[PDB]
Design a protein around this ligand. Structure first.
Ligand code: CHL
Ligand code: CLA
Ligand code: CLA
Ligand code: CLA
Ligand code: CLA
Ligand code: CLA
Ligand code: CLA
Ligand SMILES: CC(/C=C/C=C(C)/C=C/[C@@]12O[C@]1(C)C[C@@H](O)CC2(C)C)=C\C=C\C=C(C)\C=C\C=C(C)\C=C\[C@@]12O[C@]1(C)C[C@@H](O)CC2(C)C
Ligand SMILES: CC(/C=C/C=C(C)/C=C/[C@@]12O[C@]1(C)C[C@@H](O)CC2(C)C)=C\C=C\C=C(C)\C=C\C=C(C)\C=C\[C@@]12O[C@]1(C)C[C@@H](O)CC2(C)C
Ligand SMILES: CC1=C[C@H](O)CC(C)(C)[C@H]1/C=C/C(C)=C/C=C/C(C)=C/C=C/C=C(C)/C=C/C=C(C)/C=C/C1=C(C)C[C@H](O)CC1(C)C
Ligand SMILES: CC1=C(/C=C/C(C)=C/C=C/C(C)=C/C=C/C=C(C)/C=C/C=C(C)/C=C/C2=C(C)CCCC2(C)C)C(C)(C)CCC1
Lengths: 218, 225, 81, 205, 213
């Protein structure tokens, strides 16, 4: 339990120095990084913790879903459109949006129906997340357990803490990756796999400096 | 005693809740290897039960010493686990796609020669998956990874757990082994399904030697439909 | 006919209904549903070999409901598609 | 002590050295059961004797054919040649003749000495005591094998089993190399004497 | 010492000790089973000893061809000698497989005797052989054995001289291992021998960075 103890590796490595007074551990992914001083209030700290974990889970899902179709298309899978920031336009295409390019799957043709279904279902599930519903009741805002851990991988509290650290670390990495995806898609104009393939060959000029001159005023 | 526990106890247990999971598979009440015609003599006096999946079938004078019996149990378990994996992996690619996609080669005994072809081995016939074309690299990776795995098996034992039933956190994530009774019942199930898979592998070898493939001779012949 | 779509739909419907019967995902003889659909436990004087309490009455009921749902689905799909 | 196959390693506990030619080579632990050792030594004796016979029959006739004094055909095609009798009839005749020998062998290995008496004339017998060693006039014409052994018998037994193992390796080598190369063993021998590096396993494929 | 701070797991007593172990693999919590106090230094020094010969022989044919006292047919690239047949091949009196089997058998004999000596110090000093038990005496530690044939020169009279020599050996091993790693990186990037890379930085100091390809 190196992370949870009063001596943890911190975000500077061995040469860390000052650690915030309130950050005594007791939380997954505690690296003593509060340079902005935003979570000084305890309730604000709890709200920011909730935001962090929800964002981490959403970003892990987003990174997986932004990488998988592109990797499949590169590997040889047929798609109507595979670029992560272009996949939304398939609903406005004549062929329609078909899962894995198969007309026998989903075969969605209207955007309004998708929007209405998403609004209704996500409203229901977020209301459940805030007030408890069919899958259980609110015990901890972030870690409900029970029906959402059916296999019981977090029965042991020590293993529970270790899994918390693992999940938060993977999630923060995924969040950083999603920010990278957004900025690279708006700068280069090609998918993450295209950028990686460009960096694979001739990395000297396949970087941000190549496009550093595209936003000069004039 | 996780959530999977008491769930296996209610549903997955093979005996009624009032009756323990011992008597039908351990003790003097075992079904024995000749059914209702077994007779006392055909059960060796040292095969008294008390171990998973024994039917008193030692026609030759093997075992008869505890060390031999325990060893042979361990090789039986290992061959059985590997045979379960082998049979399911031999039957999955032929089920998912029986066509001869150039990089696929669904036939189980013909995929070895697929590496020497130009198309190589394309997982699920996807051109960008692995696409291996060298047998020597596969040889080296097999040697290194399996040497490490088996060295960890026979040297990195926790010195407190069973060599072939380690249990613990890593090998029992769902905690099926909370109760010794259901643990013994699960061991019996594992042994029996493993033996079934071993016979499936032997029959697969024989029928591949004689007849063509697995789906055919099961859909082409003997089940004319 | 064995590999046909109708056969697959019928076998899937019957299998799913039986699965929801044997495991406590649907009402059965030994598991009564309340006004709130809660599946409380009920004791019936029916003896079965299934350790989970699944009886022959439950087998017949789940098979019947599965055949019914499968026929409805097959006819609806044929009429639409 | 004795020269082990692997220096510096403990020999298997079940091999005390009493049996002839005990090199302590049991990597797979196939002789952990003491009653299995007797059957295994009998089986290895029978294969080694028949292997010495086979090695002689596959090498000496072919070598003398190479010398030119003999015209023995290649042993691989010996069974396809024409003979005055039906080969299957020959098989059944040898089967019937050898059934008595196999019965004798089984009876003596299960129960030593129970077939040591000549049935037709009970006076005739064999002088052997060890299981699988009959001696006598029929099987030991020269009286070799019944000697007070302080160092006499064991060396002979050891070189016998060593030659047997070498012949076993030789006959499987001959079969394998004829399968791999469609030429007799003498052709491979001449190739390896002419240029060992050029002609090898990789040379053919 | 050693840039990053030490954790007293090693005090500098070991031959060739510097303390640059930021992770601390010999940490007893992180050490066990395969990890042995004797085994890791032995493995390090053997990888370094073979790196000596590897670094020397990756350039010896090319530099000998450069100076002009070796046959020009031996100027083959180090990767074309037969280590990786797909890249190329070099002429020989026998097939590469045959010499491979020969060298594997001989290295098997030598390595087996060395491993027996490491496991049991009496190996080839009290074993059975044609008089080589008295010619392969096990002296001192297994990693630094010496012997009647090993100590023919007799160098290393004083323990201070021994420690000086050994720290020199480990430093040379580390530099050789880094050199050989650079050899593979240059071979996989430029596709040429390291000697030609020397010829290039000597000829064109600004020839290239990495590969630019
Ligand atoms: C573990 C069980 C195992 C078994 C029973 C087989 C048995 C077989 N392999 Mg095989 N292999 C097995 C593991 C492996 N093989 C190979 C690499 C190959 C190759 C390259 C080839 C075979 C072929 C074969 C088949 C023909 C045998 C032959 O050539 O004569 C046969 C089904 C050949 C084949 O498929 O021809 C029809 C063939 O070319 N195998 C590897 C990689 C090291 C294995 C890893 O464990
Ligand atoms: C936050 C999670 C998330 C979200 C919002 C999406 C959103 C989307 N995915 Mg997706 N996906 C995700 C995670 C996600 N993915 C993950 C984790 C995987 C890997 C298992 C995939 C694998 C995947 C495939 C294989 C396909 C989609 C497709 C789609 C699109 C059609 C939606 C549909 O009909 O279903 C839509 C843009 C389809 C598409 O057209 O993509 C371009 C499609 O064929 N997804
Ligand atoms: C001991 C177990 C075992 C072994 C040795 C193999 C070996 C192999 N499998 Mg396989 N497989 C296994 C279990 C196993 N499988 C199981 C349990 C499943 C079910 C999930 C599968 C499902 C599977 C698929 C779906 C595919 C393979 C394929 C392959 C071949 C190339 C893939 C590779 O990297 O190797 C190779 C012969 C690929 C192939 O081309 O096989 C013909 C392929 O597409 N396997
Ligand atoms: C997949 C769903 C499923 C379904 C539909 C059934 C259905 C049935 N099981 Mg069953 N069973 C299941 C899963 C299922 N089981 C599982 C997963 C196990 C392993 C624990 C068992 C173990 C089991 C046993 C041990 C026995 C049954 C028996 C029975 C039958 C009871 C009839 C009766 O009233 O006897 C009166 C019934 C047909 C009993 C029977 O008579 O079978 C013929 C019986 O003895 N089952
Ligand atoms: C995949 C699911 C599916 C689909 C697409 C359909 C589709 C259809 N069903 Mg159907 N059905 C289903 C499942 C499904 N069903 C199931 C599970 C059952 C229970 C067994 C039924 C029982 C059922 C009955 C009893 C009837 C239909 C009818 C119909 C038709 C519509 C007539 C209608 O609504 O008029 C609108 C009616 C009013 C506004 C009143 C239509 C083809 C009807 C039909 O066949 O008419 C020709 C009809 O009578 N269905
Ligand atoms: C009539 C029934 C009958 C049958 C089927 C046999 C069958 C056999 N006898 Mg046999 N035997 C019989 C009557 C019979 N015997 C009688 C009446 C006697 C006189 C007491 C013998 C005395 C006898 C001797 C002495 C031996 C056999 C042996 C054998 C076996 C080898 C012969 C063969 O072809 O194989 C064979 C199993 C041989 C054998 O295998 O013994 C180990 C052997 O050595 N038999
Ligand atoms: C070939 C692989 C290899 C191996 C197995 C080792 C193994 C070792 N090195 Mg080492 N080292 C290597 C390559 C290797 N080195 C190379 C290529 C360099 C050049 C940078 C170094 C530079 C180096 C330094 C500078 C130090 C070690 C040290 C150590 C020891 C402590 C590290 C540990 O706990 O594990 C250990 C014996 C430390 C030590 O004290 O060793 C005695 C130490 O201070 N190594
Ligand atoms: C080599 C051999 C067997 C080898 C077995 C080995 C290595 C076993 C090794 C180990 O088990 C030990 C010891 C101990 C264990 O702890 C470890 C291992 C490692 C497992 C059999 C030979 C056996 C050799 C035999 C029996 C030879 C037979 C000869 C025949 C058939 C001749 C036939 C012909 O007469 C015909 C029919 C007509 C014409 O074709 C002409 C000819 C060709 C002359
Ligand atoms: C043995 C070796 C090279 C051997 C080469 C040989 C024999 C070559 C032979 C031939 O090429 C010739 C001559 C030419 C032809 O005939 C072909 C062959 C036949 C192919 C290199 C080793 C090379 C070894 C290397 C590179 C080792 C690197 C180790 C590192 C970096 C470790 C770092 C750390 O461990 C510390 C120190 C402390 C920890 O706390 C933290 C970390 C960071 C983990
Ligand atoms: C009981 C008893 C008693 C008394 O004593 C009498 C007697 C008789 C003696 C006995 C008996 C016994 C027996 C029966 C046995 C058996 C065995 C077996 C069968 C095995 C297997 C075994 C088996 C096995 C392992 C198997 C394995 C497998 C595998 C891995 C596979 C793999 C693969 C795959 C996936 C796929 C691909 O494509 C191909 C391959 C690559 C190939
Ligand atoms: C013994 C056994 C078992 C089981 C098995 C099986 C295989 C079962 C199954 C069963 C089943 C599978 C059943 C089924 C049933 C079904 C049914 C019962 C149905 C009915 C139907 C109906 C009723 C219909 C009707 C109708 C309608 C409604 C529509 C129109 C037409 C008509 C009128 C006809 C177990 C596992 C336990 C164990 C092992 C052995």
């Amino acid at each position: 339990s190196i992370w949870y103890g009063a001596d943890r590796p911190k975000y500077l490595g061995p040469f860390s120095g000052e650690t915030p007074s309130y950050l005594t551990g007791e939380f997954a992914g505690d690296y003593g990084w509060d340079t902005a001083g935003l979570s000084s209030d305890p309730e604000t700290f709890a709200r920011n913790r909730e935001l962090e974990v929800i964002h981490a889970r959403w970003a892990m899902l987003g990174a997986l879903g932004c990488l998988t179709p592109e990797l499949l298309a590169k590997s040889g899978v047929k798609f109507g459109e595979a670029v992560w920031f272009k996949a939304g336009a398939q609903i406005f295409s004549e062929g329609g949006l078909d899962y894995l390019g198969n007309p026998s799957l989903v075969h969605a043709q209207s955007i309004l129906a998708i929007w209405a279904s998403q609004v209704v279902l996500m409203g229901a599930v977020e209301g459940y997340r805030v007030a408890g519903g069919p899958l259980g009741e609110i015990t901890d805002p972030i870690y409900p357990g029970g029906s959402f851990d059916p296999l019981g991988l977090a029965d042991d509290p020590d293993t529970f803490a270790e899994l918390k650290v693992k999940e938060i670390k993977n999630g923060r990495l995924a969040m950083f990756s999603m920010f990278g995806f957004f900025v690279q898609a708006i700068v280069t104009g090609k998918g993450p796999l295209e950028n990686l393939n460009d960096h694979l060959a001739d990395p000297v000029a396949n970087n941000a400096w190549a496009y550093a001159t595209n936003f000069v005023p004039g | 005693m996780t959530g999977i526990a008491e769930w296996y106890k209610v549903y997955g247990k093979s005996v009624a809740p009032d009756q323990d999971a011992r008597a039908p598979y351990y003790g003097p009440n075992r079904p024995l290897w000749k059914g209702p015609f077994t007779k006392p003599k055909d059960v060796p006096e040292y095969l008294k039960g008390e171990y998973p999946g024994d039917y008193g079938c030692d026609i030759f004078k093997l075992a008869r010493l505890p060390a031999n019996y325990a060893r042979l149990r361990t090789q039986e378990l290992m061959n059985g686990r590997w045979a379960m994996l082998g049979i399911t992996g031999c039957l999955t690619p032929e089920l998912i796609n029986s066509n001869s996609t150039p990089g696929f080669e669904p036939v189980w005994f013909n995929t070895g020669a697929q590496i020497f072809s130009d198309a190589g081995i394309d997982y699920l016939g996807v051109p960008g998956f692995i696409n291996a074309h060298s047998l020597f690299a596969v040889i080296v990776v097999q040697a290194l990874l399996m040497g490490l795995a088996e060295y960890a098996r026979i040297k990195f034992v926790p010195e407190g757990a069973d060599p072939f039933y380690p249990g613990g956190k890593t090998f029992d994530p769902l905690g099926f082994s909370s109760d010794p009774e259901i643990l013994a019942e699960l061991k019996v199930k594992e042994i029996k399904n493993g033996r079934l898979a071993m016979m499936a592998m032997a029959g697969l070898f024989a029928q591949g030697a004689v007849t063509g493939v697995s789906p055919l001779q099961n859909l082409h012949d003997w089940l004319h439909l | 006919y064995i590999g046909s779509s109708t056969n697959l739909i019928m076998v899937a419907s019957t299998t799913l209904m039986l699965f929801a019967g044997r495991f406590g995902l649907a009402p059965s003889a030994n598991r009564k549903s309340t006004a709130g659909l809660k599946l409380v436990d009920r004791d019936s004087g029916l003896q079965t070999g299934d350790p989970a309490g699944f009886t022959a009455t439950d087998t017949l009921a789940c098979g019947a409901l599965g055949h019914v749902i499968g026929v409805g689905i097959v006819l609806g799909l044929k009429a639409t598609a | 002590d004795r020269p082990l196959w692997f220096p510096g390693s403990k020999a298997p506990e079940w091999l005390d050295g009493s049996l002839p030619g005990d090199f302590g080579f049991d990597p797979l632990g196939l002789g952990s059961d003491p009653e299995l050792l007797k059957w295994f030594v009998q089986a290895e004796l029978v294969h080694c004797r028949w292997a010495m016979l086979g090695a002689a029959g596959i090498f000496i006739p072919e070598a003398l054919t190479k010398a030119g004094i003999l015209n023995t055909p290649s042993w691989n095609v010996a069974g396809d040649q024409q003979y005055f009798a039906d080969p299957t009839t020959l098989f059944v005749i040898e089967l019937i003749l050898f059934a008595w020998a196999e019965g004798r062998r089984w009876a003596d290995i299960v129960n030593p000495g129970c077939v040591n008496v000549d049935p037709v004339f009970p006076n005739n017998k064999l002088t052997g005591t060890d299981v699988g060693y009959p001696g006598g006039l029929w099987f030991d014409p020269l009286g070799w094998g019944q000697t007070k052994d302080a160092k006499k018998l064991k060396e002979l037994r050891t070189k016998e089993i060593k030659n047997g193992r070498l012949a076993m390796l030789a006959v499987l080598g001959a079969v394998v190399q004829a399968n791999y190369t469609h030429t007799g063993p003498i052709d491979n021998l001449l190739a390896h004497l002419a240029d060992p590096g050029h002609n090898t396993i990789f040379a053919l494929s | 010492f050693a840039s990053k701070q030490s954790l007293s797991y090693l005090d500098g007593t070991l031959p060739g000790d510097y303390g640059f172990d930021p992770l601390g693999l010999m940490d007893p919590e992180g050490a066990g089973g395969f990890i042995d106090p004797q085994w890791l230094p032995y493995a390090e020094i053997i990888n370094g000893r073979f790196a000596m010969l590897g670094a020397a022989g990756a350039i010896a044919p090319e530099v000998l061809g450069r100076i002009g006292l070796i046959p020009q047919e031996t100027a083959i690239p180090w990767f074309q000698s037969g280590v990786i047949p797909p890249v190329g091949n070099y002429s020989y009196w026998a097939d590469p497989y045959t010499l491979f089997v020969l060298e594997m058998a001989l290295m098997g004999f030598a390595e087996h005797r060395r491993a027996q000596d490491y496991y049991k110090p009496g190996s080839m000093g009290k074993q059975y052989f044609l008089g080589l038990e008295k010619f392969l005496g096990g002296s001192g530690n297994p990693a630094y054995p010496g012997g009647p044939i090993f100590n023919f020169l007799g160098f290393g009279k004083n323990e201070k001289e021994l420690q000086e020599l050994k720290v020199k050996e480990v430093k040379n091993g580390r530099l050789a291992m880094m050199a050989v790693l650079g050899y593979f990186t240059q071979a996989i990037f430029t596709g040429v021998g390291p000697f030609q890379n020397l010829l290039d930085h000597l000829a064109d100091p600004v020839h290239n960075n990495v590969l630019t390809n």
